[PDB]
């Protein structure tokens, strides 16, 4: 239901701002 | 450039984490 | 109960992470 | 420096997050 859906979504997005962020930090790396 | 737009679109991404956990957080008091 | 507990970790982890996050920002503008 | 510690922190915020996001998704399944 939604509270599941909610979570899934969630994790979803932070994955999200995991890649992105691992992009940064090698970019700060140069 | 590259590193910038990473975090806007992480610091983006962890909002939209946010409001979906806080979905969530009120369906479980539910 | 557990999964209470666990949501409202995430979201004190995820507030953590959008400060250290606002930090990282300004550091990239200078 | 400040932005790479920062960047680091965030990351280790993020990964917290998930583990007790899979720990809530677990519970709500049960
Ligand atoms: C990567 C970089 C590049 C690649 C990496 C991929 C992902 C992530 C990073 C990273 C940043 C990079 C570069 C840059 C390119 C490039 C590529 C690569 C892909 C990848 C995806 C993701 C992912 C995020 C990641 C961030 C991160 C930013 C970084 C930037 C730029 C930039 C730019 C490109 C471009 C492409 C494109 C891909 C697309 C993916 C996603 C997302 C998004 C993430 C963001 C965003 C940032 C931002 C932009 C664009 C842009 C978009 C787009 C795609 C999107 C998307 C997103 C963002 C866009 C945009
Ligand atoms: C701030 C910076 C500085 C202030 C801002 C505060 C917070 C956040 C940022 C930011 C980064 C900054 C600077 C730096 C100082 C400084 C201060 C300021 C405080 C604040 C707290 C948070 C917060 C995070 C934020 C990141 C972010 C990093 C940034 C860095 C350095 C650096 C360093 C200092 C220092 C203090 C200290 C405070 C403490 C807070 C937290 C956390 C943590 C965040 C991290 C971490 C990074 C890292 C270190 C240390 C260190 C620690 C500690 C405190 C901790 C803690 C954390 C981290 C430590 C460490």
Excluded: D, P
């Excluded at 899934?8 to 994955?15: F, G, K, M, N, R």
């Excluded at 701002?17 to 970019?27: D, E, V």
């Amino acid at each position: 239901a939604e509270a599941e859906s909610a979570l899934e979504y969630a994790q979803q997005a932070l994955e999200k701002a995991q890649l992105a962020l691992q992009a940064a930090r090698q970019a700060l790396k140069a």
